[PDB]
Amino acid sequence: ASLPHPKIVKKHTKKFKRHHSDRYHRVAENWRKQKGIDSVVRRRFRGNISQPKIGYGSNKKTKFLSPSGHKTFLVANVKDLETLTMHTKTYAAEIAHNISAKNRVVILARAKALGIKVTNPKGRLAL
Amino acid sequence: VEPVVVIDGKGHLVGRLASVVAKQLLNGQKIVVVRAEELNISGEFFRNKLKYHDFLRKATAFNKTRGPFHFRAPSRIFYKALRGMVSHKTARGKAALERLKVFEGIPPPYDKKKRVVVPQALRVLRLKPGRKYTTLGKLSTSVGWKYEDVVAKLEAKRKVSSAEYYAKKRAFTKKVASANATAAESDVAKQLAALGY
Amino acid sequence: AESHRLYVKGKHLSYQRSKRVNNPNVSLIKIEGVATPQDAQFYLGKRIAYVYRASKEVRGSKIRVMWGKVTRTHGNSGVVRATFRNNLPAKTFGASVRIFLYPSNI
Amino acid sequence: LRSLTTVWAEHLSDEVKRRFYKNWYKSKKKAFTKYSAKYAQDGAGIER
Amino acid sequence: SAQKAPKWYPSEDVAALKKTRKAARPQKLRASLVPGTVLILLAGRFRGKRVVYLKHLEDNTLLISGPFKVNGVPLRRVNARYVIATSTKVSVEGVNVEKFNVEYFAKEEIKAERVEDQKVVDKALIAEIKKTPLLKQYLSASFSLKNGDKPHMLKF
Amino acid sequence: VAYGYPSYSTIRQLVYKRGFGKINKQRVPLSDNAIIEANLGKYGILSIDDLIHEIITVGPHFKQANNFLWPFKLSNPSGGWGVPRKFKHFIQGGSFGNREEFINKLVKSMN
RNA sequence: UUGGCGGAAAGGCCUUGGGUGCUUGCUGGCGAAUUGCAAUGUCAUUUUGCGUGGGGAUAAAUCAUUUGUAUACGACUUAGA
RNA sequence: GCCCUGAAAAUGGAUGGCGCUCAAGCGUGUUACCUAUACUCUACCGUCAGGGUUUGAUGCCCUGACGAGUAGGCAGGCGUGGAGGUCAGUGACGAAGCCUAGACCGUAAGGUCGGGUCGAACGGCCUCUAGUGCAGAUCUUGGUGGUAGUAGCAAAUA
RNA sequence: AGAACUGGCGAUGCGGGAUGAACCGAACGUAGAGUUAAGGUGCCGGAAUACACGCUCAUCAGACACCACAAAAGGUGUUAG
RNA sequence: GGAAUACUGCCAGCUGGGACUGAGGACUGCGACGUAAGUCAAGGAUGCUGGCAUAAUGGUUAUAUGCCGCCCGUCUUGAAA
RNA sequence: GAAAUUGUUGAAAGGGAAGGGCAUUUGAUCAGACA
Numbered sequence A: 001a002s003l004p005h006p007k008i009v010k011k012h013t014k015k016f017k018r019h020h021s022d023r024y025h026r027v028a029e030n031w032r033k034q035k036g037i038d039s040v041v042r043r044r045f046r047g048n049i050s051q052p053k054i055g056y057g058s059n060k061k062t063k064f065l066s067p068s069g070h071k072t073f074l075v076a077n078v079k080d081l082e083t084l085t086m087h088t089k090t091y092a093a094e095i096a097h098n099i100s101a102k103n104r105v106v107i108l109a110r111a112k113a114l115g116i117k118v119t120n121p122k123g124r125l126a127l
Numbered sequence B: 001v002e003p004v005v006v007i008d009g010k011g012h013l014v015g016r017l018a019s020v021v022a023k024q025l026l027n028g029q030k031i032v033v034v035r036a037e038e039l040n041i042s043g044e045f046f047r048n049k050l051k052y053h054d055f056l057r058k059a060t061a062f063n064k065t066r067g068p069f070h071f072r073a074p075s076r077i078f079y080k081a082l083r084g085m086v087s088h089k090t091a092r093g094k095a096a097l098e099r100l101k102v103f104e105g106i107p108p109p110y111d112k113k114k115r116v117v118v119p120q121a122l123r124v125l126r127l128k129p130g131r132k133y134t135t136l137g138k139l140s141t142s143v144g145w146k147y148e149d150v151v152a153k154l155e156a157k158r159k160v161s162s163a164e165y166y167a168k169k170r171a172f173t174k175k176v177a178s179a180n181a182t183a184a185e186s187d188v189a190k191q192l193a194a195l196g197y
Numbered sequence C: 001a002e003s004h005r006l007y008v009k010g011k012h013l014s015y016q017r018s019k020r021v022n023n024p025n026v027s028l029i030k031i032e033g034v035a036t037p038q039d040a041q042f043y044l045g046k047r048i049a050y051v052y053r054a055s056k057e058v059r060g061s062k063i064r065v066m067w068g069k070v071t072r073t074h075g076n077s078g079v080v081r082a083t084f085r086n087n088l089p090a091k092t093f094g095a096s097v098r099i100f101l102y103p104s105n106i
Numbered sequence D: 001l002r003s004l005t006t007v008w009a010e011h012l013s014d015e016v017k018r019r020f021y022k023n024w025y026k027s028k029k030k031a032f033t034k035y036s037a038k039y040a041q042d043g044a045g046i047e048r
Numbered sequence E: 001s002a003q004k005a006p007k008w009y010p011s012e013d014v015a016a017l018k019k020t021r022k023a024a025r026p027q028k029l030r031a032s033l034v035p036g037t038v039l040i041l042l043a044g045r046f047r048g049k050r051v052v053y054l055k056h057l058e059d060n061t062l063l064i065s066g067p068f069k070v071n072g073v074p075l076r077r078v079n080a081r082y083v084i085a086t087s088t089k090v091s092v093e094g095v096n097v098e099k100f101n102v103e104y105f106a107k108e109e110i111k112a113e114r115v116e117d118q119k120v121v122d123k124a125l126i127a128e129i130k131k132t133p134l135l136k137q138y139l140s141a142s143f144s145l146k147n148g149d150k151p152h153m154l155k156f
Numbered sequence F: 001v002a003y004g005y006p007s008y009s010t011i012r013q014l015v016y017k018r019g020f021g022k023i024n025k026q027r028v029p030l031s032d033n034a035i036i037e038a039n040l041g042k043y044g045i046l047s048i049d050d051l052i053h054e055i056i057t058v059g060p061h062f063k064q065a066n067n068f069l070w071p072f073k074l075s076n077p078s079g080g081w082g083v084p085r086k087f088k089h090f091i092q093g094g095s096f097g098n099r100e101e102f103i104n105k106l107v108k109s110m111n
Numbered sequence G: 001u002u003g004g005c006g007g008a009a010a011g012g013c014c015u016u017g018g019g020u021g022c023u024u025g026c027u028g029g030c031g032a033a034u035u036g037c038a039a040u041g042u043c044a045u046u047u048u049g050c051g052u053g054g055g056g057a058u059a060a061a062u063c064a065u066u067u068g069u070a071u072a073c074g075a076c077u078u079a080g081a
Numbered sequence H: 001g002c003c004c005u006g007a008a009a010a011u012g013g014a015u016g017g018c019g020c021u022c023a024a025g026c027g028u029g030u031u032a033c034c035u036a037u038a039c040u041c042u043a044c045c046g047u048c049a050g051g052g053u054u055u056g057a058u059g060c061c062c063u064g065a066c067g068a069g070u071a072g073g074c075a076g077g078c079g080u081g082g083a084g085g086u087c088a089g090u091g092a093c094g095a096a097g098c099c100u101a102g103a104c105c106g107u108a109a110g111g112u113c114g115g116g117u118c119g120a121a122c123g124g125c126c127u128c129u130a131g132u133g134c135a136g137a138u139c140u141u142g143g144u145g146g147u148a149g150u151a152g153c154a155a156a157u158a
Numbered sequence I: 001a002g003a004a005c006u007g008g009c010g011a012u013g014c015g016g017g018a019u020g021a022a023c024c025g026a027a028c029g030u031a032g033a034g035u036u037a038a039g040g041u042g043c044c045g046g047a048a049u050a051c052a053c054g055c056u057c058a059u060c061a062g063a064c065a066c067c068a069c070a071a072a073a074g075g076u077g078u079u080a081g
Numbered sequence J: 001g002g003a004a005u006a007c008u009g010c011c012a013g014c015u016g017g018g019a020c021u022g023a024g025g026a027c028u029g030c031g032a033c034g035u036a037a038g039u040c041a042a043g044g045a046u047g048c049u050g051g052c053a054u055a056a057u058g059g060u061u062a063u064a065u066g067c068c069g070c071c072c073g074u075c076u077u078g079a080a081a
Numbered sequence K: 001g002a003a004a005u006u007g008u009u010g011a012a013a014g015g016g017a018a019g020g021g022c023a024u025u026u027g028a029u030c031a032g033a034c035a
């Protein structure tokens, strides 16, 4: 139900984990670029971790497309879900994390009505 | 090719028989060598002794235990030269080295199996005639390998009962020939030779 | 009969490698009896399967297969380069492989 | 050098028997009872 | 709203393809492939089977028969690349062959028609097989590489 | 460098396969004789074999007509260089210098 | 099953007698399809467990106590229906 | 010319290692082959540029070339506390926070989701403002390990 | 220790020199296929235990730029002058 | 005296096998084959068939295996030191 | 009611540390897609 798109090519599925966030607990994976003077990572010696740079950049044509081929859009209520009415083949809806259980079934409904894909159509579903 | 290759040690050059045996194990071909005590090494005896007393002196200083292990058995001196030609601290190399057996003499079952030879390792095709060379267990025996004469006695035992089988074989391959001769000239025979057989 | 074999026996040697750097995307095969690059021109494009066994059942079998194809001759003694749908595990250096007779040009 | 068999006499002394046992007073003293049965016949197993 | 909204949206209209230029041209099979040549089946259910080539088909496959009365292969489709063409031959000039086409094999056990079709084509072939002795028995036996067969050396 | 005296044969293949034009810079591939008559018509030279002509003949416009050509980008020798070490003179078994008519068989394995 | 040989890790070789399966050495009578044009198309041997029942067998060591030919402790060596 | 002699040092040891002697040594010739982040071709990313084009015109489209970087400069961005405006935004039918080798978007800073725990507030967008982003400073305060059931708990007669 | 020109290292990874700031090669967006450089192709190790004419036998042989040394002087060893 | 052949080069001579790639997405350009109407390999892959429709492809993850990877920060010509 | 750090359960691996990069096998576990 998506638009046609080329094969979605990633170029790096591995996450970039900041040098040594495996070593010290105090070092958070959250990527950081070493400025040190001796750092084998900055100097790019063989066998060290790869660094983020512009060439890894996803293709413009498949950029932002989830696996299903829809650019995902955040929806807190029907009015937001309704901005997607004409784009059913472009965007899918994601229901926001805080929307009340009762207001989800409302949206889930209106969306099935409009043919708008919803990505997280389970959250807070009594079953 | 074969699920096991028994090589005959006698009269091959240690270096080259090693190099060939190695790659086979790194390539997955189980190999067992026999009669290593009859291996040859280029250069005369006395040089290869000093060459062994040079290995002999190297030992880890504070504990002569954890230092280089100097093996005096002909099968070992050969296993050495192999081991050095494998990457033997890798898992891949533990694999290799486990495919290979080495022995003095030709012990059981190997003795009832045909054994091959490595042409590129043969001393007779490889040395130029008149270059001196050493015989392993003679070297090994000077560096302390105790069992040379137990090998000798047991090989002099084997080769007798080997000749007795080869006798019986020969006589029977003669019967074979004589029936196969009366098979020549027949309808089959000339048909067969027509096709290469 | 006894013999049912439809392929030539072949061995998995290395990855393609320089001295210190390998390349799992490409493997090096020894093919039974193929002695020369000439000889190995016969086998290019011919399709390899590596057969291994498992403990779990999957599509109805405890046997599994990785498929590949000879790409090009490798050096002077008849080694040949192949490339596999998913690369070979390199536990498999010294392992048996199967080079089937097809695509046939005979 | 390698030992390829042993042969033991029929009757073993209760001193030697005591050597195969860590606690002799508790044992059933079974040592070499079945071995002694090798003598019931002409002892062709022994002689072998 | 919990997410703002795009100022622009891409067009959901789907464009047509540029008019491709590739023509469907006849596939020429190799010189080994001539009707009445014996085939070795390399793969598939009947792999190892020795078979008789009949007609080059419209879908590029190869019509062959065992013949069935001998080795059990019926009239069947087979793919060129998956087969070794042997040098030994039998005359197909006695075999109808033209009934058979792509639709004769449409997928939609055995119908009365094919049963009869087979016995037909087979009688014609079993005739020319009897002409040359040992060839019935060679067409029944299966092909296997013995230790020492080197297909790159091997004449067929 | 290695250099020498190019044959008709190789000047042709050079400009057919790897000949490229300088048009407002921008390295334009040739492929159509009319891209030549655009730029090089001012001198004559409306065709690609007109271009080759000016080059092998060293005609009166050779400056413009050569300069027009993007510097050819050649692969490495497909048969490899011959000789083990490149940076002696061809005379001494190296590859650099003026190899004269031998420039041909090289530039062809590089094309 | 008859008899023999093999200790280098023998554990394997060789032989006699009958029973019995196959024999493509040769000649007959059937079967083979639809696994759909390929898909290893599954045929090997490793250890283990659980039941049925067929032979066969019905012990020790440890703690504790104890000796001092032993001992830092563990260990060692002895003793006790 | 090669070889021998001239040629003595302290842990045991290095043509890199094994080893090699009509070499796996030395001199020289010819091929073939192996493989760098280099060279060629194509895809994608970014940057610069030259065109085209009145409905995201800060836009779309065509085309070519380029891409190393400490000190450093510029740029476009990511995140935090608070402020002006907006979405009549989320919420006790569960806000915020925490947990989660579960799922998704980005090169990335980061963003989104599900499940758990939870209780009372909180977020998008366009702007404003700063006590705005930590691995280190023998950094400050607090908190906790390994050492470790360890050193030890033997002066003063019992 | 200190000057001249240039190229470098510092600030720079990558392939080769086992190893190594400066040598050789070649400089770096993400990938694919091809081909090469410097260096290599018994085995460790991808690649001819390739072909070819010779030299060399060392009771301390010899084995590849920068490079991890050797000299004067001798030999009725052998080789070609 | 007449050839052959080697050797070097040329062909806008014909042809088999293998590998990687299929960007783009109405038409528009340069041409090509045709007496013609048409056709084409001419400004970027389409035609035919089969399997599966699920953890099978893939993602993630632990691990094993091949190869590689020295502790970061710092001052310094030079830091794993 | 976060982290250091710790008990028990579950799983896994471990021949003189541990950790990393490329890649696949295997175990586990999951999204999507199709209809």
Ligand SMILES: CN[C@@H]1[C@@H](O)[C@@H](O[C@@H]2[C@@H](O)[C@H](O[C@H]3O[C@H]([C@@H](C)O)[C@@H](O)[C@H](O)[C@H]3N)[C@@H](N)C[C@H]2N)OC[C@]1(C)O
Pocket: I068, I069
């Ligand atoms: C680079 N490593 C070196 C190691 O090679 C060696 O240094 C040598 C030293 O032995 C040499 O020096 C020594 O050895 C040489 C001979 C071997 O050239 C003799 O000529 C010289 O008289 C003697 N002093 C000197 N010429 C160069 C250093 N690189 O010893 C010191 C070291 C640091 O371990």
Ligand SMILES: CN[C@@H]1[C@@H](O)[C@@H](O[C@@H]2[C@@H](O)[C@H](O[C@H]3O[C@H]([C@@H](C)O)[C@@H](O)[C@H](O)[C@H]3N)[C@@H](N)C[C@H]2N)OC[C@]1(C)O
Pocket: K013, K014, K015, K017
């Ligand atoms: C999960 N924790 C680790 C686990 O990763 C694994 O470690 C292996 C390790 O044993 C491997 O094995 C290696 O390391 C061990 C170790 C005891 O030092 C050595 O004894 C051994 O020689 C070496 N091959 C090593 N190559 C990789 C790790 N993933 O083994 C258990 C562990 C060490 O506790």
Ligand SMILES: [Mg+2]
Pocket: A012, A013, A014, A015, A016
């Ligand atoms: Mg990612």
Ligand SMILES: [Mg+2]
Pocket: A021, A022, A023, A024, A025
């Ligand atoms: Mg950690």
Ligand SMILES: [Mg+2]
Pocket: A021, A022, A023, A024, A025, A026, A027, A028, A029
């Ligand atoms: Mg951490």
Ligand SMILES: [Mg+2]
Pocket: A037, A038
């Ligand atoms: Mg530095």
Ligand SMILES: [Mg+2]
Pocket: none
């Ligand atoms: Mg001793």
Ligand SMILES: [Mg+2]
Pocket: C023
């Ligand atoms: Mg590559």
Ligand SMILES: [Mg+2]
Pocket: C024, C025, C026, C083, C084, C085, C086, C087
């Ligand atoms: Mg691959």
Ligand SMILES: [Mg+2]
Pocket: E070, E071, E140
């Ligand atoms: Mg039959």
Ligand SMILES: [Mg+2]
Pocket: none
């Ligand atoms: Mg090549």
Ligand SMILES: [Mg+2]
Pocket: F080, F081, F082, F083
């Ligand atoms: Mg070359």
Ligand SMILES: [Mg+2]
Pocket: F083, F084, F085
């Ligand atoms: Mg070279």
Ligand SMILES: [Mg+2]
Pocket: none
């Ligand atoms: Mg000397």
Ligand SMILES: [Mg+2]
Pocket: none
């Ligand atoms: Mg040495």
Ligand SMILES: [Mg+2]
Pocket: none
């Ligand atoms: Mg070498």
